[PDB]
Amino acid sequence: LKILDCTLRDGGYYTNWDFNSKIVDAYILAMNELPIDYLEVGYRNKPSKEYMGKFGYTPVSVLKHLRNISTKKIAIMLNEKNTTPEDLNHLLLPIIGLVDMIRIAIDPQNIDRAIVLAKAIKTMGFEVGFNVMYMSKWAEMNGFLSKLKAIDKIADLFCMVDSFGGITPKEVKNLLKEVRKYTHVPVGFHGHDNLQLGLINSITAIDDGIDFIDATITGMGRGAGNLKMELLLTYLNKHHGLNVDFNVLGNIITTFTPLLEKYQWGTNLPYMLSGANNIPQKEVMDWVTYSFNSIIRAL
Amino acid sequence: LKILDCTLRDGGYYTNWDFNSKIVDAYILAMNELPIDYLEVGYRNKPSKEYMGKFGYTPVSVLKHLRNISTKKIAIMLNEKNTTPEDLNHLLLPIIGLVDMIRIAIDPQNIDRAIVLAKAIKTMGFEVGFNVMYMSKWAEMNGFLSKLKAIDKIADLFCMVDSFGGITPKEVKNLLKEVRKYTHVPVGFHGHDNLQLGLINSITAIDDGIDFIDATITGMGRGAGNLKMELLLTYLNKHHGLNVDFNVLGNIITTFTPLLEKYQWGTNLPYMLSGANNIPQKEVMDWVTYSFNSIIRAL
Numbered sequence: 393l394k395i396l397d398c399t400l401r402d403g404g405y406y407t408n409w410d411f412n413s414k415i416v417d418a419y420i421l422a423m424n425e426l427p428i429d430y431l432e433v434g435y436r437n438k439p440s441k442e443y444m445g446k447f448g449y450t451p452v453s454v455l456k457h458l459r460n461i462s463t464k465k466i467a468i469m470l471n472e473k474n475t476t477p478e479d480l481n482h483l484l485l486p487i488i489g490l491v492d493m494i495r496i497a498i499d500p501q502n503i504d505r506a507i508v509l510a511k512a513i514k515t516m517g518f519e520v521g522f523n524v525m526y527m528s529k530w531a532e533m534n535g536f537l538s539k540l541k542a543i544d545k546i547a548d549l550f551c552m553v554d555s556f557g558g559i560t561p562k563e564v565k566n567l568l569k570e571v572r573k574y575t576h577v578p579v580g581f582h583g584h585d586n587l588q589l590g591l592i593n594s595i596t597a598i599d600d601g602i603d604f605i606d607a608t609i610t611g612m613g614r615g616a617g618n619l620k621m622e623l624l625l626t627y628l629n630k631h632h633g634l635n636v637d638f639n640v641l642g643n644i645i646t647t648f649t650p651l652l653e654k655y656q657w658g659t660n661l662p663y664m665l666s667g668a669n670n671i672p673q674k675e676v677m678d679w680v681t682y683s684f685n686s687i688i689r690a691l
Numbered sequence: 692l693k694i695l696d697c698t699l700r701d702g703g704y705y706t707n708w709d710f711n712s713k714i715v716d717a718y719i720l721a722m723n724e725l726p727i728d729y730l731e732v733g734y735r736n737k738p739s740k741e742y743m744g745k746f747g748y749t750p751v752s753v754l755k756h757l758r759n760i761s762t763k764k765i766a767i768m769l770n771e772k773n774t775t776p777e778d779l780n781h782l783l784l785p786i787i788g789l790v791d792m793i794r795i796a797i798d799p800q801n802i803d804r805a806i807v808l809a810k811a812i813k814t815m816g817f818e819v820g821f822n823v824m825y826m827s828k829w830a831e832m833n834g835f836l837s838k839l840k841a842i843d844k845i846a847d848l849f850c851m852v853d854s855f856g857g858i859t860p861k862e863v864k865n866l867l868k869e870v871r872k873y874t875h876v877p878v879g880f881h882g883h884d885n886l887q888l889g890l891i892n893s894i895t896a897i898d899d900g901i902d903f904i905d906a907t908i909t910g911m912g913r914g915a916g917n918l919k920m921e922l923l924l925t926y927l928n929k930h931h932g933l934n935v936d937f938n939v940l941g942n943i944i945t946t947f948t949p950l951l952e953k954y955q956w957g958t959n960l961p962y963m964l965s966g967a968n969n970i971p972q973k974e975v976m977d978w979v980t981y982s983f984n985s986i987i988r989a990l
Contacts, residue, residue, distance in 0.1 A: 561860075561891065587890065587922065587925075587926060588887045588889075588890055588922065589890070589891060591886065591887060591888070592860065592888060592891045622960055622963065623886065623887065623958075623963055626886070626960070626963040626964060626967050627886060627963075627967060629967070629987075630857075630967040630968060631859075631967075637984065638960070638964070638982075638983030638984050638986075638987060639982045639983050639984050641960065641983070642960050642983050645959075645960055659922075660944075661921050661925070661937070661940060661941050661944055664921065664922055664925040664926075665925060665937070668925050668926055668928070668929040668930075669929060683937075683938045684937030684938055684940070684941050685936065685937050685938045687937075688928070688937060
């Protein structure tokens, strides 16, 4: 089992992906002393119209430093809908040797196009990860699962993403079993905490032999956020015999506490509603800003 | 299935059981428009030297008021350790007709002494609930479960309390089965959110036919707190066809928000540790006030 932390990449939302070196160094060094195998530190992007900070572009200068002080594997993410095979040269060529894995945020609707991208990334020598969204819609997408056999020689990770934060333990088991019937590649799970099922869904996947689990420090992420890495490690230390340095865990939590008190990610009634009814949380929170009853009558 | 809310009784810890009557009224009226069957509003107590707020005594005058506006079942709690049968007349006689159920906080060690108490209460015409602590220890207590047949004619509810907030779905399912083999009375579950397993533990019990579930608005309660009532209802509304007035839910959450902003109940690293390692939270948090690794090494 490999544990991947994506705090900076997923939590950057609130700070325009800007993080000062003091937080970045504390984070990287803490990860060295925690049982976390992969660190997804940010995105690689083409020039954005609206401002995006440091970790939205994750420049080479930063990666050389992180690679210098980190003893774990490093990953960055690419948004499939914004990347063509022709963009790979400027996006990835400069980071060869500095980054281990390139994860791709993919909408299941574009899986075939993503496979073309993945294939190209693989020839550059990177490990390739597929972070496929809307796992709650897979079962009813005709021929989708059958399209996964095409990733057998490319994917190093097939990550199931609980996009709405409404997936239940039973559904996670079923989907994992299903994916195993169509692809031989390592499988992962990235749960959201809209219903606070992040921990139990992850433990459920872990006990069924899943290969990868995503989480972030204090669950930092947009809206209801992600599974809290500290919660995962605490649980595994007790029930799975995972050795953990809690002193470091507590210190890294403290590092991110000022941002948490300011931005306060975490679930609430609007996010609980979006999770249980598979509605993107930004849609629902914007409505609250419909009475809640109207939001549910419309369903 | 009956749902019980004990926000004022459990949450009163922060304000020494004193609440602005505007808060109380808002709470009671809101409970009239939510699918909540029982409301545990406070404790009953013998005169105390140190000052204790209104809901530590739940006076007849406030009960008459609550009984007049609420359309739901009302309950109060007695601490078994501070209650003898001779205390009952002064404690309960005054509330005949105002309170439906008398819940008793019980240590599994003192079950027999508690049954003597429940008999006297039952004679008075009240419904009786057993809130037995440390469910995580019952399985290893010789004769405990096996002797619950003694409550068959006096208990209207046998509530299993997740005292440390570390019990898991599997254990809840097994304990529920065990209890069913020894007593015929309705069973309930009161989970804690130290590991944020309150919801899944509760749903697990509900799916196995449990009779009662405990929760509080925003999970208000000591330390990590309890299952968030808003969370239970949102989940049941989607998965169990439960009709819920989300406008009222959202409003009552708002009513308690200022208290949450001030007291900040909810799990954290110290409480995750105490939950996973079956230690009372006041024990761990007080050590933090031992590094986290030292708290665990001593284990």
